[PDB]
Amino acid sequence: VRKDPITKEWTLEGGALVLADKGVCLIDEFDKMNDQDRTSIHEAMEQQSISISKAGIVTTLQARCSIIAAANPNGGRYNSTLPLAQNVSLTEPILSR
Amino acid sequence: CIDEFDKMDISDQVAIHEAMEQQTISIAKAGIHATLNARTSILAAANPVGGRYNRKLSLRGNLNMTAPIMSRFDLFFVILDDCNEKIDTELASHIVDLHMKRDEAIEPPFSAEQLRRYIKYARTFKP
Amino acid sequence: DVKKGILLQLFGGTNKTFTKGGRYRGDINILLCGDPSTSKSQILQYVHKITPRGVYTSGKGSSAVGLTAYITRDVDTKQLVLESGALVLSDGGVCCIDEFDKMSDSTRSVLHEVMEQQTISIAKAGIITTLNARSSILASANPIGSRYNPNLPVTENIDLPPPLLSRFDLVYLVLDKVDEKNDRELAKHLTNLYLEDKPEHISQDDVLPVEFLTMYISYAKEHIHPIITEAAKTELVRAYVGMRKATTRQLESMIRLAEAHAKMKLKNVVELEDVQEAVRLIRSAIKDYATMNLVQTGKSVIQRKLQEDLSREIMNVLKDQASDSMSFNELIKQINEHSQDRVESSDIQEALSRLQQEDKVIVLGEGVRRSVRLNN
Amino acid sequence: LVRSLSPGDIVDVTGIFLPAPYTGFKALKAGLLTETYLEAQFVRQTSDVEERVMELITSGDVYNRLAKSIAPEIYGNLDVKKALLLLLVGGVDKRVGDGMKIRGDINVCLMGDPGVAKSQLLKAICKISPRGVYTTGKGSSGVGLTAAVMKDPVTDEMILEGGALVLADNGICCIDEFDKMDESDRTAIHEVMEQQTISISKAGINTTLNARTSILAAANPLYGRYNPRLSPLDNINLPAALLSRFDILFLMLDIPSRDDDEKLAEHVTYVHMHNKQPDLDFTPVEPSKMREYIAYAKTKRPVMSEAVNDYVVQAYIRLRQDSKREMDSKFSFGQATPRTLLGIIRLSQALAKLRLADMVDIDDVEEALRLVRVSKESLYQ
């Protein structure tokens, strides 16, 4: 929730998830995702609900979206015979999700 | 014709996306959220990493920067300069004459205005 | 030779519109550096004095905008009014730039446009346009030293982008050998006046024109249009050949410049002669280069050398590891160990990063640098 | 009569003094006042006194005597004072034949902190010096030094009202908190080291004023004080570009010393204890008659011996030579740039004028040197 373009009353907006609640969340290049987001992702995947405490407003939206993700094996197509978790960047805890 | 994409540093790679994508122009300053499609040819450029690094070094990563947007590029002509002082001489002459204000008979096999006109023609055809 | 190269800058080049475009004008951009108090200021003073359209500016007293398009509120009519910044004004004549090395990075972004284009395109704000400003560039700089110090890469020792560097037409480098034996003489000159306190007999006895100069300059400007014909061509080439044996622009320079020389002496065609000194003058910064570079350092033995040994070792410790990973530590260890060309563990870290990121290497951990697999 | 006038002018004006009706806040006026005005019709911009000088002269040692006689109020630092003397004296400038001029004047830096009451000196000079002006950084605004074009009354209109430099020009200008003056100030000053030069292109000002002032700079070292572990120019915040301009940088640093501190302590006890500090025996010079003798000396315009010229040269080579032989840091500042030379030239040129000279004897030179070596190198203690 942030100040709108210049002057209007300050509008609380969702990430794609709450938007896609019960819909579907389509994203790619998580390797390209800032941890700032990454926490959000883990949070939803875990709780399936998005809590928001700022500024004054404190809530939890419920995003029911299913996760669909395209990603880039770190560098080379097949990074390694090494397990994919090795063969790719993203964190296994998230991955197990 | 975007010179020195290098000076993009890290901000334009963001741009390449829509650019390479729909050339949609996504704008929300929140004044509005508006995607402006575009279609524009890419006449593009950058320097190699260390000067002309490309010789032993692999182009990819000898070019470096464009990350995936790299993958968005259909063609590439690598330019390196080795003197055939034959050739060196050649261009040398070429230049010189050019530098000589006159007389340059540098004239295109086809007339240029004629060209642009023709260009109009070629667009018309749809192979 | 300074005073000379300048003099040419006064006579500089000749404008050529081609059929259309063309328009190399006569422009020549000279830069000069050295130990400070060189009078390096004083000159800019003199030229600025002479130059009808010239303007003198300080580094950092500046940014890319003040040179153009203030677009201020007129406020006389309570209007907004487009105000030519410094450069548009300076179109014609020359520009006097203090503290070039010190200019804001935002600033001088301007320059590349100017220098190359010789014009300026402002799409900004209410009106989008490309305005032409054609003017000569005289820039002053202080090596970091501020004495650039012996050896070093000079090209380093000057700081600046080696490209933007390369852009400047005339690269003048000033230095002091402590001719004893000079200081004496200089001190005689200097020590004069003295007498007279009321300004009199500055350089006497020596022959010099005064205002006749100004006029002469004017006329020569107006009435002269030199053309080099064929003569120059051959030697001219052989020169720049020896040079690259360096850049084309060097040639280009040589062209415009010599054109000033024969412009002086009122030659409508060039002697193949007078190109000699024309080269020589370039050979001066080179003769000032005695006592591009970036790449040179950066090739093995510099960076190619660097990464080469790097990979080499990586391969080695792999082999000796039964192919297991090389450690960050052992890496750093053998790499400073074979000692010689001094691979600093930071530099090590950097090049390593390069190969890995180049997928010329594949490795990881905090204090754990495993090995690579270069697939590329 | 229009256009004849310029700011920072000392002029005798002749005009009939005429009122024009005005008052303050309406609730503020009994009536009628006049608020008045002035009108301008016309503008005008060594006999037995040599005796008064001769009192000083005949005593001799006028350089040291007077040296002492400057601000005797403070204990110590006869060297700096001696400098201040020449600072007050100046000379001889020059013009080049075309001609270009060369100042012509002294530029003094006073380093060190906190104490010295270093300012106290500045107060002194600005007091004694006619056309001296005491200022501080935040302090005197840039527009304090610069002139605004602002209408003036009675006559008309859009008046360039100058300050500081323009105000005190042909006479010294005193700067305090010199570190705190920020930047725009720093620029201008950097420029006015061209002497005779201030230029305002802003808006309704195309004019370039001539400032003849002399400059005295009091600043505190980078906090807190002169880290000896900090190199020179490390402990010193300022750019050499300006430092290059500064002719005399007196760096005043304090290492406590039992013995002398006794001495100074006594001075300070005697006065206040006495209003009069100097006793047994020093005759300090009345800044009045002092100023007189100064006037008389200022007339001299000495000329240099070729020999002094030569020694000067040799020494100068020695100077640049050792200065660079120093090479990297500590120590320093190098390089003894020509301006070092030129400066010393003006310096001896002044010392001579204390002799009233025209001779410019080599001793005056060697003195200027001793002074020079003296200014810095205090870093070694």
Swiss-Prot record, chain A:
Family affiliation: Belongs to the MCM family.
Annotated compartments: Nucleus
Role: Acts as a component of the MCM2-7 complex (MCM complex) which is the putative replicative helicase essential for 'once per cell cycle' DNA replication initiation and elongation in eukaryotic cells. The active ATPase sites in the MCM2-7 ring are formed through the interaction surfaces of two neighboring subunits such that a critical structure of a conserved arginine finger motif is provided in trans relative to the ATP-binding site of the Walker A box of the adjacent subunit.
UniProt-recorded name of the protein: DNA replication licensing factor MCM2
Effect of residue 97 to A: Loss of MCM2-7 complex helicase activity
Any further remark recorded for this protein: Present with 1690 molecules/cell in log phase SD medium.
Residues of the full protein shown: 580 to 676 of 868
Subunit structure, as described in the record: Component of the MCM2-7 complex. The complex forms a toroidal hexameric ring with the proposed subunit order MCM2-MCM6-MCM4-MCM7-MCM3-MCM5; loaded onto DNA, forms a head-head double hexamer.
UniProtKB/Swiss-Prot annotation, chain B:
Superkingdom: Eukaryota
Signal peptide extent: none
Motif (Arginine finger): 71-74
Annotated localization: Nucleus
Miscellaneous: Present with 13400 molecules/cell in log phase SD medium.
Record's subunit section: Component of the MCM2-7 complex. The complex forms a toroidal hexameric ring with the proposed subunit order MCM2-MCM6-MCM4-MCM7-MCM3-MCM5; loaded onto DNA, forms a head-head double hexamer. Interacts with MCM10.
Family classification: Belongs to the MCM family.
Its job: Acts as a component of the MCM2-7 complex (MCM complex) which is the putative replicative helicase essential for 'once per cell cycle' DNA replication initiation and elongation in eukaryotic cells. The active ATPase sites in the MCM2-7 ring are formed through the interaction surfaces of two neighboring subunits such that a critical structure of a conserved arginine finger motif is provided in trans relative to the ATP-binding site of the Walker A box of the adjacent subunit. The six ATPase active sites, however, are likely to contribute differentially to the complex helicase activity.
UniProt protein name: DNA replication licensing factor MCM6
Annotated source species: Saccharomyces cerevisiae (strain ATCC 204508 / S288c) (Baker's yeast)
Residues shown, of full length: 637 to 763 of 1017
From Swiss-Prot, chain C:
Motif (Arginine finger): 166-169
Boundaries of every MCM domain copy: 1-191
Binding site for ATP: 34-41
Localization per Swiss-Prot or TrEMBL: Nucleus
Remaining remarks: Present with 8800 molecules/cell in log phase SD medium. Early fractionation of eukaryotic MCM proteins yielded a variety of dimeric, trimeric and tetrameric complexes with unclear biological significance. Specifically a MCM467 subcomplex is shown to have in vitro helicase activity which is inhibited by the MCM2 subunit. The MCM2-7 hexamer is the proposed physiological active complex.
Assembly notes: Component of the MCM2-7 complex. The complex forms a toroidal hexameric ring with the proposed subunit order MCM2-MCM6-MCM4-MCM7-MCM3-MCM5; loaded onto DNA, forms a head-head double hexamer.
Function recorded in the entry: Acts as a component of the MCM2-7 complex (MCM complex) which is the putative replicative helicase essential for 'once per cell cycle' DNA replication initiation and elongation in eukaryotic cells. The active ATPase sites in the MCM2-7 ring are formed through the interaction surfaces of two neighboring subunits such that a critical structure of a conserved arginine finger motif is provided in trans relative to the ATP-binding site of the Walker A box of the adjacent subunit. The six ATPase active sites, however, are likely to contribute differentially to the complex helicase activity.
Family: Belongs to the MCM family.
Encoding gene (name): MCM4
UniProtKB/Swiss-Prot annotation, chain D:
Localization, UniProt: Cytoplasm; Nucleus
Domain MCM: 62-269
Domain of life: Eukaryota
Motif Arginine finger: chain residues: 244-247
Binding site for ATP 1: 75, 115, 117-119, 220
Quaternary context: Component of the MCM2-7 complex. The complex forms a toroidal hexameric ring with the proposed subunit order MCM2-MCM6-MCM4-MCM7-MCM3-MCM5; loaded onto DNA, forms a head-head double hexamer. Interacts with CSM1 and MCM10.
Protein name (database record): DNA replication licensing factor MCM7
